[PDB]
Write an enzyme that holds these catalytic residues in place. Structure first.
Site, PDB file in Angstrom:
ATOM      1  N   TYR A  19      42.437  40.471  36.515  1.00  0.00           N
ATOM      2  CA  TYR A  19      43.058  40.673  37.853  1.00  0.00           C
ATOM      3  C   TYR A  19      43.403  42.143  38.119  1.00  0.00           C
ATOM      4  CZ  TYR A  19      43.676  35.831  36.397  1.00  0.00           C
ATOM      5  OH  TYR A  19      43.509  34.581  35.809  1.00  0.00           O
ATOM      6  N   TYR A 151      48.489  26.198  36.728  1.00  0.00           N
ATOM      7  CA  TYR A 151      47.372  27.136  36.575  1.00  0.00           C
ATOM      8  C   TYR A 151      46.349  26.494  35.656  1.00  0.00           C
ATOM      9  CZ  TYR A 151      44.503  31.149  35.391  1.00  0.00           C
ATOM     10  OH  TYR A 151      43.440  32.001  35.205  1.00  0.00           O
ATOM     11  N   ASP A 248      46.108  19.046  31.004  1.00  0.00           N
ATOM     12  CA  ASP A 248      45.550  20.315  30.603  1.00  0.00           C
ATOM     13  C   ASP A 248      46.473  20.907  29.541  1.00  0.00           C
ATOM     14  OD1 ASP A 248      44.831  22.944  30.236  1.00  0.00           O
ATOM     15  OD2 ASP A 248      44.593  23.473  32.335  1.00  0.00           O
ATOM     16  N   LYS A 277      42.471  28.002  23.803  1.00  0.00           N
ATOM     17  CA  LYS A 277      43.364  29.063  23.310  1.00  0.00           C
ATOM     18  C   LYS A 277      43.629  29.008  21.796  1.00  0.00           C
ATOM     19  CE  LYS A 277      45.862  30.053  27.641  1.00  0.00           C
ATOM     20  NZ  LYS A 277      45.909  31.545  27.658  1.00  0.00           N
TER      21      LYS A 277
HETATM   22  C1  2B9 Z   1      46.603  25.814  31.035  1.00  0.00           C
HETATM   23  C2  2B9 Z   1      45.424  26.582  31.201  1.00  0.00           C
HETATM   24  C3  2B9 Z   1      45.431  27.960  31.063  1.00  0.00           C
HETATM   25  O1  2B9 Z   1      46.614  28.526  30.730  1.00  0.00           O
HETATM   26  C4  2B9 Z   1      44.275  28.768  31.186  1.00  0.00           C
HETATM   27  C5  2B9 Z   1      44.301  30.157  31.139  1.00  0.00           C
HETATM   28  N1  2B9 Z   1      45.397  30.857  30.791  1.00  0.00           N
HETATM   29  N2  2B9 Z   1      45.309  32.117  31.058  1.00  0.00           N
HETATM   30  C6  2B9 Z   1      46.265  32.969  30.643  1.00  0.00           C
HETATM   31  O2  2B9 Z   1      47.315  32.615  30.107  1.00  0.00           O
HETATM   32  C7  2B9 Z   1      46.120  34.290  31.089  1.00  0.00           C
HETATM   33  C8  2B9 Z   1      47.292  35.011  31.351  1.00  0.00           C
HETATM   34  C9  2B9 Z   1      47.252  36.310  31.857  1.00  0.00           C
HETATM   35  N3  2B9 Z   1      46.014  36.907  32.134  1.00  0.00           N
HETATM   36  C10 2B9 Z   1      44.829  36.177  31.891  1.00  0.00           C
HETATM   37  C11 2B9 Z   1      44.887  34.869  31.388  1.00  0.00           C
HETATM   38  C12 2B9 Z   1      43.093  28.115  31.560  1.00  0.00           C
HETATM   39  C13 2B9 Z   1      41.887  28.807  31.752  1.00  0.00           C
HETATM   40  O3  2B9 Z   1      41.460  29.350  30.479  1.00  0.00           O
HETATM   41  P1  2B9 Z   1      40.346  30.537  30.449  1.00  0.00           P
HETATM   42  O4  2B9 Z   1      41.072  31.833  30.925  1.00  0.00           O
HETATM   43  O5  2B9 Z   1      39.191  30.223  31.306  1.00  0.00           O
HETATM   44  O6  2B9 Z   1      39.892  30.730  28.898  1.00  0.00           O
HETATM   45  C14 2B9 Z   1      43.095  26.732  31.712  1.00  0.00           C
HETATM   46  N4  2B9 Z   1      44.275  25.980  31.527  1.00  0.00           N
END
Ligand code: 2B9
Ligand code: 2B9
Lengths: 429, 428
Positions: A19, A151, A248, A277
């Protein structure tokens, strides 16, 4: 071979960041040169300094960086087989991992679809749900319902179930699917909330494929916690109105919230589940979407005959091997005690932050600590302060927060919480 | 797990690509090792050596377990497995970005790392959408392409897949409705480009971009087209002010006989996707590149930023093995290597042209295709290839290969011999 100054110069000219802009960044990114255990080595004024990775590199680094057992599992796999296509072939790392995941996730999740990121596993979850109903003769059931504050990723489907202010924005008027949104789920349990949810779902039920949520903790949409009882109500509502339930758990998974998966706090099983993650111990990108035998067999017996998805690198041996080892390592220790101690450490350390002028909430849930302020946190003020204290923090909006590695010592939690308390104090000024 | 236990866990719990659970007409074969161009597979309880004719879907250009790439990975692993890319940068990312801006078609100055092909495609579309919003034209939001394409499985990527397809009839209504020009033919035809222009003209005010695979359409049909069409697309796009996007996820890194397939025409797109061969097939990584102007217009827009950021963005391990894979490609005479591969493919497949069930034989760089007159039965093809020491994965009516660049002339001959024998069996 590039020096830190050369890295900066290449980065400014050529690298997008999350972003971010090109050539309008308010501050240069800091050069990271190493990561070992709970620590990152960063360049500040041309000098390498070691700082705590308070954020576990966004929830990922649960055993810390370069854990000997995880490095070893990766290099052991590297010598045998880096990768093979998953079309017409199978392998041991995929088998072992699928085995572990089905055993340790909430009951009834019997099949596993590997993909290369969280957003992709979400779109697979949605595709399972959509194909499910087409396989039931109900193609009208195609919309998604969620609650605000969520999110789920940045791909276009995933975006449609993100919080509309989280960024929809206004900025994407059309091009997003128009999904069903319930109000923000509150912290404390209120049966009136679940009743209003059900009434709203009830009238859309004939066009809804699924409800999709983050269970217990909403992460990137604002670090909010809600009573697990709400998840029990969702399961109930979804059963009664014949709408699938998707949890999720990409951020909440693998012990983070004090249970192995946050769904366990409520004692409920969703129909479809996403993990990612922490799955790989933060080494590599991998995700999985699990679904019940019923969902699997309805898809497979439908007109298409198959789930119509399949990334090139699906079930990558290297990712699956380091994941297997990351999962066994968590399970082979008393992880519940570790998280409890971490929660206690966070609670104790962050305590004095609530008596601060700019602070509206201090909340802890498992290995997650949040300080909510009454205004935005100034990054150009906050970052300096935390670096000086030997801590890498990354506030967003009005939130100073942490999800530290499971391997952090009491001394390290103390050091993380102290830098957080300080970031909050400077917000007051 | 023993192979038998792997099979048991697999049929119970593993989804495969485009597959069912419990209705698989064939079991998967256990793979237990991969070295150079060779896979070790378990067949009837015995390990066998087979050539990776598909390069594990275009990925393994240097073969499996190449010492330079294994070592690049273990070196990074020793130093830093991964850090967050928000607020932080690192040497693997910078090195790979530097390399990618230097070797891609001129004018591609910025680099967005993601974790897969489908994501990088969604990132490309986002870039285009945000560009036109930054120009005050939020009406420019549709995409246009030609039939026969494939760009991935996420929902936006799906909208530009060929409608027949994967599989718009069963989808649509959830898919954004994009603009489709007819199938691009093999030989250059000026009337095709005139009609493409005429169709684009009547959507120009609502089109953000044209998106195509250049020169070779992979998963949609292994079709080749004349590179002059890309020259026409670049000209059309410039005159009507629609961005041009090349999806080079399958075509990149030497595979069609030029470094990038856009090079066959000397054309620079505004936006480009790379993947697959990028990491030498070790790990999933992808990248979306765009011009400085696209970058600046997005950045000065209302958002002030490209609104995308995957958790594992610019993963050091994946970037490091990629840096090593690209450098190994550039530090050898890859162009001669690919020509040799192509000659060997053409020589080896010549005989299939005469076969009763063969409708076409075609080669383009290190890619060889036998197009047959009926869909290929995998239950026949698969053991036939395995009996000849080759892993082939036909789809639809195609028996095809994209071998690792390291394959010796004898290995290319073994691969094409297997392909010919598969094609002989189809005809019966
Ligand atoms: C609950 C949940 C998520 O938290 C995420 C992504 N999380 N992203 C971050 O925590 C993040 C934070 C700050 N900058 C970039 C990504 C996603 C998307 O994962 P992805 O970034 O495509 O590997 C899907 N479900
Ligand atoms: C040109 C092009 C692509 O060829 C691809 C994906 N290619 N997929 C395969 O070749 C493939 C074929 C059969 N089964 C699985 C993958 C994609 C999607 O990449 P992804 O599958 O997400 O890693 C985007 N653009």
């Amino acid at each position: 071979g590039l020096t830190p100054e050369q890295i900066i110069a290449v980065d400014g000219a050529h690298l997008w960041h999350p972003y971010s802009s090109i050539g309008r960044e308010a501050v240069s990114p800091v050069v990271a040169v190493a990561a070992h255990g709970a620590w990152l080595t960063l360049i500040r004024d041309g000098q390498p300094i070691e700082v705590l990775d308070a954020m576990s590199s966004w929830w990922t680094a649960i055993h810390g960086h370069g854990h000997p057992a995880l490095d070893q599992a990766l290099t052991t796999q590297l010598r045998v087989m880096n990768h093979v296509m998953f079309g017409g072939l199978t392998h041991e790392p995929a088998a072992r991992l699928a085995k572990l995941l089905v055993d340790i996730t909430p009951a009834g999740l019997d099949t596993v679809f590997f993909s290369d990121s969280g957003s992709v596993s979400v779109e697979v979850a949605a595709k399972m749900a959509l194909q499910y109903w087409r396989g039931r003769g109900l193609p009208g059931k195609r919309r998604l319902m969620t609650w605000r504050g969520g999110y789920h990723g940045d791909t276009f489907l995933a975006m449609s179930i993100c919080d509309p202010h989280g960024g929809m924005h206004s900025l994407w008027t059309d091009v997003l699917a128009a999904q069903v949104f319930a109000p923000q789920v509150p912290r404390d349990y209120d049966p009136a909330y679940s009743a209003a949810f059900e009434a709203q779902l009830a009238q859309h039920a004939g066009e809804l494929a699924a409800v999709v949520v983050e269970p217990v903790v909403q992460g990137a949409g604002g670090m909010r916690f809600h009573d697990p009882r709400y998840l029990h109500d969702l399961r109930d509502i979804c059963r009664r109105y014949e709408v699938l339930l998707i949890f999720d758990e990409i951020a909440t998974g693998f012990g983070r919230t004090g249970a192995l998966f946050a769904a366990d706090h409520a004692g409920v099983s969703p129909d479809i589940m996403c993990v990612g993650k922490a799955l790989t111990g933060g080494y590599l990108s991998l995700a999985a979407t699990l679904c019940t035998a019923d969902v699997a067999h309805t898809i497979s017996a439908g007109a298409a005959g198959a789930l119509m998805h399949g990334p090139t690198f699906m079930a990558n041996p290297l990712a699956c091997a380091v994941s297997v080892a990351s999962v066994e390592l968590l399970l082979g220790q008393d992880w519940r005690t570790r998280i409890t101690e971490l929660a206690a450490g966070l609670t104790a350390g962050l305590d004095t932050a609530r008596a601060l002028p700019a602070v509206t909430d201090v909340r802890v849930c498992g290995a997650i600590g949040v300080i909510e302020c009454d205004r935005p946190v100034d990054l150009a003020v906050a970052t300096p302060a935390a670096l000086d204290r030997g801590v890498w923090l990354r506030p967003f909006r009005n939130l100073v927060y942490a999800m530290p590695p499971y391997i952090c010592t009491p001394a390290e939690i103390t050091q993380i919480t102290s830098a957080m308390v300080e970031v909050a104090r400077l917000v007051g000024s």
